Amino acid sequence: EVQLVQSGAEVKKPGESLKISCKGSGYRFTSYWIVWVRQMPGKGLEWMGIIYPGDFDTKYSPSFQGQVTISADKSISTAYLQWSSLKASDTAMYYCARLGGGYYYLDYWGQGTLVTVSSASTKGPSVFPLAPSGGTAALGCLVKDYFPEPVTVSWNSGALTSGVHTFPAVLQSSGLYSLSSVVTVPSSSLGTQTYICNVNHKPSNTKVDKRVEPK
């Protein structure tokens, strides 16, 4: 099975250098061109360049020439994309793909590497209870001012899944994120069932368990 596996998501500050990777397996790595593509959040595909690992033949798109370095390490079947000085505008998803099969096309893709570049510093969230029509009540918690993503929210340590709606975060002008999770429950269950939102924020080594009760 042919396969291209890219390196994990990166969160960086502007000015830092970064080298991300694309590892080939199940084929002769030196015998196929590797393409790099950029996709900024919510935008289209942009060709960055291409490289033939066999002889390091490398071509860049005009808009990327001199902005980034494409290279390869033959001995470990890995192609690379690197920056010497990250800009916030380098925030994007990066894909690699193999040009293969008698005319070739992009037949295998890496899973993508997300690069987030921001001046924001790591910060754990402040969690606030959102206290509770028909026999149905809505309650939740507000996960305020954290960086970076992701935060994971569960209810009653994963015991409550039905009626749970966790909304995608907003990015504020401060560079910090905020999200909300709300759960819909039978109103008859209020005061007979405990409701606690478990908010884990790995990057800040912070986990909060917020009990939510009627005002």
Binding site: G44, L45, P62, Y103, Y105, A138, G140, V170, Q172
Partner: protein, 212 residues
């Protein structure tokens, strides 16, 4: 330096046929081969057409490429539309050893129920007020199509400052959700008689109100 121009969005009923055109600004389209890629949200692109009209294995025969040299364009044609064909489609060709992508076309498969948003509005928690802060939370869900406008009001007066709103995002049930946050000092919150979140969708407005 040539560009590949394609329409921002096409749409069609399921079972029918839709066409996505790709036009190049310089040179003749027959000079370089044209590829098409499909990309669903949260996923890597896949090749669906290469070498103008070839179909990679695995790709349904409902996908086909063509070239129209008179209008200097290439086309992706999808017959017998299915909901899974909802995605972004990118054409791609060559300009002297450098790859050029079209801007992409969002394909919408019609037929989905139009739904008005459900709005839940939360006042600032007693705990947040203790930290000398206040946030109003407007949760907007189950609306289709995915486009809403949010307006905040202090009593009956518009509020522009301290407003952050998300883009609509697709839920699991193929409807859309979004949220809006109004930031206030505890003093502003105690000052007014009420605050309101107004959500407009397809010309109709749902308004929720909370009070200190």
């Amino acid at each position: 330096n040539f560009m590949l121009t394609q329409p921002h969005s096409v749409s069609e009923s399921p079972g029918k046929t839709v066409t996505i055109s790709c036009t190049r600004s310089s040179g003749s389209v027959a000079s370089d081969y044209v590829q098409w890629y499909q990309q669903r949200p949260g996923s890597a692109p896949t090749t669906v057409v290469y070498e103008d009209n070839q179909r990679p294995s695995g790709v349904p025969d409902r996908f086909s490429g063509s070239i129209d040299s008179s209008s200097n364009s290439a086309s992706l044609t999808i017959s017998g539309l299915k909901t899974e064909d909802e995605a972004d489609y990118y054409c791609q060709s060559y300009d002297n050893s450098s790859w050029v992508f079209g801007g992409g076309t969002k394909l919408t498969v019609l037929g989905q129920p139009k739904a008005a948003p459900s709005v839940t509005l939360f006042p600032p928690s007693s705990e947040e007020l203790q930290a000398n802060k206040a946030t109003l939370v407007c949760l907007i869900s189950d609306f289709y199509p995915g486009a809403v406008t949010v307006a905040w009001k202090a009593d009956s007066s518009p509020v522009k400052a301290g407003v952050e709103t998300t883009t609509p995002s697709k839920q699991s049930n193929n409807k859309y959700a979004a949220s809006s946050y109004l930031s206030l000092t505890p003093e502003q919150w105690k000052s007014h008689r009420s605050y309101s979140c107004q959500v407009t969708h397809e010309g109709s407005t749902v308004e929720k109100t909370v009070a200190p």
